[PDB]
Each structure stands twice: as C-alpha cells, then as structure tokens.
Symmetry: C3
Subunit: 54 residues, 3 copies
C-alpha cells in the first residue's frame, strides 16, 4: 500500500504475510529499504548516508 518498517532484516523476513506485495519496507537499524514483491522481497539500492548540515 505504502511504507512500513521493521527493526531489522530478520524481523522483516519472518513477517512476509504482514506486508502486501508492492509495499516499501524500511529497516530502522540499518536505515535500508526493501520492497515486498511476489514471493519475497528485493533490496532497494541506496547511496551512502548524507549527514545533516550543522
């Protein structure tokens, strides 16, 4: 539907049925993103962390 999150990848992996296909998944611990697709997930390619200006 939109975007949800999990503490980490393993939490995401065990809750495949709680996420509808085509939804974005944020991993709080690693600040990474995955997408729930048919029969699994796919990792979104993200760049290096851009620190917030002072």
């Amino acid at each position: 539907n939109l975007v949800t999150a999990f503490s980490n990848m393993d939490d995401m992996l065990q809750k495949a049925h709680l996420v509808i296909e085509g939804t974005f998944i944020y991993l709080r611990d690693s600040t990474e993103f995955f997408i729930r697709v048919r029969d699994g997930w796919k990792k979104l390619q993200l760049g290096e962390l851009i620190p917030i200006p002072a």
Copy 2:
C-alpha cells in the same frame, strides 16, 4: 501521489498520462519498480529476489 502498477513495462509506457510525476510504478510481471518523472520514467535499481523463508 504514492504507488500504482501495470502488468508490464509496455502497459506502463502507453499510460504515461494516467500516472502523476513523482509516483512509484510496480510492474507485476517482472516485479520491478519505476518512478514517473518529468517527461518520462526512471527505473529503480533493485536487488536479486530474496525468497521467502520456508
């Protein structure tokens, strides 16, 4: 606005006016993602399929 989908890329290509710029596009057949932008689309870089745990 958010996220929509098409069966495949060609269906997406012929419906450019049905998707507002800045929207995410899921291709059901290839489980790929595109983003509708100014004057076209851009393919989102996704990783290999991560199979669901047994």
Copy 3:
C-alpha cells in the same frame, strides 16, 4: 509518511526537520529521489531517463 518534494538538493538539505524519517524525497529540478533516514538522507539509485513514447 509517503512522498514529498523540493526544488533541488540544497532546499532539501536545509529542511531536514520538515521531513519525517522513512519518507521519499523527489527533487523536481533533477528528477532524482532521496530517502529521509536517521541522521540524514540516502540517494535512491535511479536509471537513465526513459522518454515518453510519441
């Protein structure tokens, strides 16, 4: 929450507190995408512009 936008990267960089972590950020001028994460942003890897069919 979902998706928002800025004219360009610099406008985005000065408004870090206007975007909640886990939100997608579209840059109108460069038609690029970033994601607001913990302590900053991360650039989404996008492909070359796919022109709209005539």
